[model samples]
Target: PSILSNKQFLAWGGVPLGRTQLQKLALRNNSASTTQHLRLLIRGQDQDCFQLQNTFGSEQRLTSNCEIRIHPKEDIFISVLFAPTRLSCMLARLEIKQLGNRSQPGIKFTIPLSGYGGTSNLILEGVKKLSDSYMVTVNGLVPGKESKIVFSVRNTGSRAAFVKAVGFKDSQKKVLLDPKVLRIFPDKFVLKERTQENVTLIYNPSDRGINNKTATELSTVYLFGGDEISRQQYRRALLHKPEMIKQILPEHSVLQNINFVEAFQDELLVTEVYDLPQRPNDVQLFYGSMCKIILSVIGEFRDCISSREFLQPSSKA
Candidate 1:
């Protein structure tokens, strides 16, 4: 018999291991007059895995281990954080009883919590083995194109075991280079009582191409264990992209802004000008020198972009 109108049974499925996630529970008092005393108690076997708070941003905390009161017509927000200390499936129940002024028997509410945890293991073959981890690098990657890097994998355990799946690890882990920019195949492939196979990791540039700053950034990959367990992931990847950025200024126009295709990781040089005419189709030899002048100017601009780093001599002199 829950006094509030929200769903009494809250089920949070597929919780991550070793990370804290949150869910908000709302309590609305629809009645006009009765001030409610909502007594909160988390009742279950794995109660320690969950924490509760009262407010939204600043005042919310885990300090309240005792009962709290609710005023009339008050909309309440209860923040529940799940930090699954357990390595297996865990359950908890939150009981909200209305201790109605001690003079009346108030209604009660029950919120059930059900969650499970699992980790992943990923291995990179032929990389320099560091302490409990490995490091590798990918070279000659263009800004906009996709390149594939191949690596072998196997189980690190005593005997052969089956791997459930292969992909990047959880989102909480530091992903210097986003997994979305890269694509891996055989997503749910079988290990077949073997360590694993030589898998291919492909890198596709992001919409913004690859920024030179985070070009050398790294990340981890995970492999799911056979029986809801995780192996271990301690690998890093360094990705680099071409440095040249496309800049197309108008020949003679106002209003700042270049109308050119946003280049990818591989497309460093933006082609904005039309190609020069083939030699000697002289429909009008008079304007032929003008085309030559334009070509010479474009060539100078190219030289400035490639060698001078966009620095060019002034034309006013």
Candidate 2:
């Protein structure tokens, strides 16, 4: 009897690092009257990452040398579990061989198996944990002043990670912070296996509107990373529209999510307040008192009286 399953290949796309994904393969006997025995084996260098299991739970598990009997016109299901240990593309082959039949003994059917192990396990140094995200606070920033915080991104997974983009996003998750207000140095970097790199975050509030008096300005710093394909996709998305980078990249590519709390001094002392007189009832009678007051304040400074201006113009005398 010949196997009736028609799948040419099995593919598990983009499983996260150190995670498991399962796919099913069906084996059906085509002969109507004869029972057939079949053997399953996995071949290739990446065969270790794939496992075969009996779907009916009768045998509980299956090894490379396992054999099973399939009745005529009957179907048997096998579960192929893929557990990726590194960040790369994995390839293997599933070989189904007909056994214990004189005419078709050793008849083999080969199916290709492919999967991608993408993403990394990253740790943010010197930050407080808030649920799943790391929290970083930049405090005591005077209005219209600048400050910076430095931290490191560590890769603990066995695979190397390619850092693609890093930026600060507002609470809405749609808009990115202005580069003048928030900037990350060396935004694109690489972290090898068990290695880390330092990242610098600079915050300059030259615009007073960005600094709140009563509340902390909240922004999220998203660090995106993955393999080469993810990096290319990120660049392509950035080339088309900067706002679509987050939407375009897959969820697993986000290596770290950080919440930045920008704190500012609550109270700013007002040295003086001048209230100008009310406008005149008639328009023609109104004198520019506000302008005169400003000029008077300017005249009080010593620098206004330049030595050359105050001295009589040098002339022939």
Candidate 3:
């Protein structure tokens, strides 16, 4: 398990496989010897045909409905567990380096998560995709302690994703957190169809509880860039008083010293803010501490969050 810094898990945190789990190795040919470069036929049931370099590298869990892939020398592991298909096969290959030298680098590999396979088609279709992402929820919320959970985020979209960390802010415009750093989802998430991505959700709660008296009491109202509302609805929405954010989180994230929301909505800009608690440490969204609500579409959403992130700005103002 990765060490979460003082409720920082609320922002972002990733869990690499431990030392006991297996890393991907070369697949064995039906002929019995380890082979590379050849498109030797793969058996859907031959579990050993795919080898893992677990003896000397990081450890990963294969429980519930989980799967992994290994690149040639890299031996890096990738997750596969969210598809509508029943027999989600994890595909892997080795880049036969006739001459190049690497300690062990698996360039790229993907396969269906074994546990979440055919047995649960109806459930898989309901799974969340990248562009339309789903979150890893949490429960049993408490103040002044760290809670833990490990879930996967699978991207069944066409483009790559850059996950952002979440943070918390009250209606009174106060950031009720300690660790201000939003954990980055720092990885190239290339999730193709019938493929899945496994992730470890690290949620570390805070030692100091939230004081409702100090947190925000007012609700948030958004002035959309365009007229999503009629003139009457606009006036009505403006007239509506703001409410407070007081509810348990639905995903895996921690909370602590967070930052205030960005004010002054921009015309061309779409701002999203969250108030769950923990988020990622870096923009890449790989893993770390802290979790908060996710803000998107400038200021239109409310109620829940898992993680968040946006592309880097063209220039630093």
Candidate 4:
């Protein structure tokens, strides 16, 4: 896949105080409250490719197409879902900073939240590095509050860095019995910095984004069994869910739904589950409180034993 790139940065928010170092890059967490996130950059003579663990203890390498934003307060977490490589990848930890001051004086997440093991080829993308003196701000504001992930990527080394692959790898992104779905959502979790707690979310994109393009390159062929009508109905049912979910979810946060089934041999199946809203201070409360409502009405409808014999004398699900 070809690489894509974008440049963004914010330096005035905080002064670059020192906290942890990976490979040679030094990062600090100035503001821990109100607005907190991670920052990693390579500096000066440290042309040495290094790994950084943002405030949430996520493993981000100097070579990773971009600086990672590990939302610390997010109880719902997703660890490294990266292409594997030899030499065993590295990671770094970070601390939150606020207004040029340490957000939390003595707290920082550990490094390399997860490991990589892709052996075929090192097709890397979305690898952006930062500078030593440059201060990267990670103020996590709400959706409408700010619509950008601001950070700078410096190329101290002689070579140019690559960005993330701009599209989906195939049309049937998730197929029942397909080998793809299992690897899509890697078992990534970072429990060390409290950055590891996160609920799984399956999003079927409304307007194609990066995933769409990625899907194009994927193999669309499958040994699906059901007739075209049933498959069409299944796809239709799957298609409306994101919209159906919209009416139920709050208007502020973005929802990411995952697929439970995909293309495969003989039989066909599909699964969907939403991420337990991982943002805003009010998210956890909602996920916890509405578990019953969602389970009964939205998610767990399958398990909600429906008895038409006595459902108001003739009601059914």
The candidate that wins on lDDT is 2
RMSD of 1: 22.4
True lDDT of residue 96, candidate 2 = 82
Q: Which stretches of candidate 1 lie over 4 Å from their true place?
A: 5-7, 14-18, 54-65, 101-104, 121-149, 152-187, 190-197, 200-317
Q: Per-residue lDDT for 27-83 in model 3, tens only?
A: 321222222222212224423323332222132234221223223332222221122
Best of the candidates, TM-score: 2
lDDT at 74 for candidate 4?
A: 28
The digit string of per-residue lDDT tens for model 1 on 24-74 reads: 877776666776667777778778887776543122344354465455666
Could you tell me every candidate's TM-score relative to the true structure?
A: 0.42, 0.56, 0.22, 0.17
Q: After superposition, how far is residue 237 of candidate 2 from its true place, in Å?
A: 15
Measured by TM-score, how close is model 3 to the native structure?
0.22
What candidate 3 gets wrong by more than 4 Å, as runs, is 1-137, 170-194, 210-317
lDDT of 2 at 303: 24
* Ranking of all predicted structures according to TM-score, beginning with the best and ending with the worst: 2, 1, 3, 4
What do the candidate models score in CA lDDT, each in turn?
A: 0.44, 0.55, 0.25, 0.23
